[PDB]
């Protein structure tokens, strides 16, 4: 239950917490695919918890301490698991035509920083 070097499926007490992604493309600034990260919970590892309040409480109790360094790596690991090669993957839209999306997200650049 661990792709690359970062975990995606885990436990807290009797609740299995599982990493998930929600994807959608936008074409206004650039043709890009935004991916948002989410945490879901199961009672047995296969059947999700039907109570919305319970799931919300569990995901917030998680999201207490995972910061960037463990959201980004899990997101990239899930994307790399979805990859077809080392540098990209393809959405199957036709028998002969495919939509090539990069497995590496867009980088930006900032001229400012600081230290811990």
């Amino acid at each position: 239950d661990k792709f690359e070097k970062t975990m995606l499926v885990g436990k807290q007490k009797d609740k299995n917490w599982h990493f998930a992604i929600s994807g959608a493309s936008k074409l206004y600034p650039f043709p890009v695919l935004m991916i948002s990260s989410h945490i879901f919970f199961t009672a047995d590892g296969k059947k999700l918890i039907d109570s919305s309040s319970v799931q919300h409480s569990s995901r917030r109790r998680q999201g207490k301490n995972w910061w960037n360094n463990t959201w980004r790596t899990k997101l990239l690991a899930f994307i790399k698991y979805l990859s077809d090669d080392d540098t990209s993957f393809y959405l199957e839209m036709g028998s002969e035509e495919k939509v090539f999306v990069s497995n590496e997200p867009v980088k930006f650049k900032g001229n400012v920083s600081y230290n811990i």
């Binding site: 930006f108 650049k109 900032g110 001229n111």
Partner: protein, 473 residues
């Protein structure tokens, strides 16, 4: 690779013409702008709860400390930070008995129970204001916790506790501050929870609202609001140019009248002859029919803008040269036509749209923290992204909790330079008088206007409401 530029962190002025980026540090050392000799405080509530208020007022009198002073500055005491006298002696006390407050709470209907519960405070406070010799600058309402459990919409009283108006909202706070508008009295709601919580415990024994580490921040949020409601100036903005007013339009839903009717509210921000900033409300509530329009008909929009230019021309002498209208919703051209006609020729009219719905989440490659607050990604001369929520180094932590969402700032109407627009929004995110924080999520115009809208949509009989935020926040 796309370039993102950082706009300078704004500075807010303090006493003696001194500047400090932080508000807590500036007040804790340099004091407020004006001298307010003393705050005569009135307390209305149960006798049992008055003990807690007096104890917490004494607690505030002594300087208090946060666990990590770097993240949140320590509180040097009200008399030191604000150089104004605020003692437990001189509090005008009105008592409500447990029996009287319990006769009304245990009711089947939420609307009438809330109406009568709030009337129980309103009548007493009106009698105090209009029948008693002593003056009360600000009135604190200490409220029990069972009320907060059963004074809110869709809060169902347990059937075992049922013992026994629809033109009013089921919200205690909104209706309460709504019905006092005709009396021009400053009020502040306190929950008996928000006070010395350590008495209140859950099943585990920990306090439900356990703030064992964060007393300093709570005291900072209480003291600044108390000073502002008394008629004092905590801090002022210094980078505002001459001849600029802003206005913030927000649309809220009204359920009492058939058709939501989407009432709109506005707030102003402009410079005044001299240096003293003017930050008041521009409230002429313009009722907007149709279920989901959110766009002003020409007549009421013209009335709004005429009122806004008036309260500037009688306060400075001449008309504004540059206006930055802000709103959560984009403007249709029908509103803009009405706006243009009322304005004179000299003024340059600008309508700016601010939104959060855009799902952008900039992660960094390495590090257990978020993006710096103050960065700006300029999509084009008309649209950009500005992270008003994010990391700032002075408070040592990001204001948001997870990786935050930037603000989509677009000049929907007018022309505007994008840099000046993204420079003033970050400046506006500083002047929160309801809470004393380093900076807030998005500019105060859209949130103070949101508050006044949520309050003014609680009472139907509101006529010419006050334009001062002291009666609202």
């Amino acid at each position: 690779m796309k370039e993102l530029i950082y706009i300078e962190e704004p500075k807010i002025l303090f006493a003696h013409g001194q500047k400090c980026t932080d508000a807590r540090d500036g007040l804790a050392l340099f004091g407020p702008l004006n001298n307010l000799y003393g705050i005569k405080s009135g307390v209305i509530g149960t006798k049992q709860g008055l003990k807690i208020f007096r104890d917490y007022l004494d607690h505030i009198q002594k300087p208090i400390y946060n666990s990590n002073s770097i993240t949140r500055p320590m509180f040097p005491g009200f008399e030191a930070v604000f150089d104004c006298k605020w003692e437990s002696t001189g509090i005008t006390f009105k008592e409500v008995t447990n029996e009287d407050i319990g006769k009304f709470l245990y009711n089947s209907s939420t609307h009438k129970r809330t109406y009568d519960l709030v009337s129980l405070f309103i009548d007493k406070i009106i009698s105090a204001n209009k029948n008693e010799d002593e003056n009360v600058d600000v009135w604190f309402v200490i409220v029990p916790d069972e009320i907060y459990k059963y004074c809110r919409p869709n809060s169902v009283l347990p059937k075992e506790m049922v013992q026994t108006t629809y033109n009013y909202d089921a919200q205690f706070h909104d209706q309460f501050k709504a019905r006092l508008l005709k009396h021009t009295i400053p009020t502040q709601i306190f929950r008996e929870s928000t006070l010395a919580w350590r008495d209140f415990k859950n099943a585990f024994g920990l306090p439900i609202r356990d703030f064992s580490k964060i007393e300093g921040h709570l005291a900072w949020t209480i003291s600044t609001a108390a000073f502002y409601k008394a008629g004092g100036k905590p801090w002022k903005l210094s980078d505002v140019r001459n001849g600029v007013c802003y206005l913030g339009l927000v649309y809220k839903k009204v359920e009492k009248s058939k058709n939501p009717r989407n009432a709109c509210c506005a707030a102003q921000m402009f410079l005044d002859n001299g240096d003293g900033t003017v930050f008041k409300g521009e409230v002429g509530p313009w009722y907007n029919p149709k279920n989901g329009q959110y766009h002003l008909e020409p007549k009421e929009a013209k009335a709004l803008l005429s009122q806004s230019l008036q309260s500037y021309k009688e306060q400075i002498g001449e008309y504004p040269k540059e206006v930055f209208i802000h709103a959560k919703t984009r403007f249709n051209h029908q509103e803009w036509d009405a706006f243009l006609e009322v304005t004179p020729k000299e003024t340059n009219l600008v309508g700016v749209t601010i939104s959060k719905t855009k799902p952008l989440k900039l992660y960094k490659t390495e590090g257990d923290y978020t993006i710096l607050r103050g960065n700006a990604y300029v999509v084009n001369e008309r649209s950009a992204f500005l992270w008003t929520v994010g990391y700032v180094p002075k408070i040592q932590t990001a204001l948001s909790m997870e990786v935050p969402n930037p603000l989509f700032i677009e000049i929907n109407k007018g022309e505007a330079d994008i840099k000046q627009v993204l420079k003033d929004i970050l400046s506006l995110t500083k002047l929160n008088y309801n809470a004393c924080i380093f900076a807030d999520g998005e500019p105060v115009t859209l949130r103070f206007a949101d508050k006044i809208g949520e309050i003014l949509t609680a009472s139907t009989d509101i006529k010419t409401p006050p334009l001062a935020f002291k009666y609202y926040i």
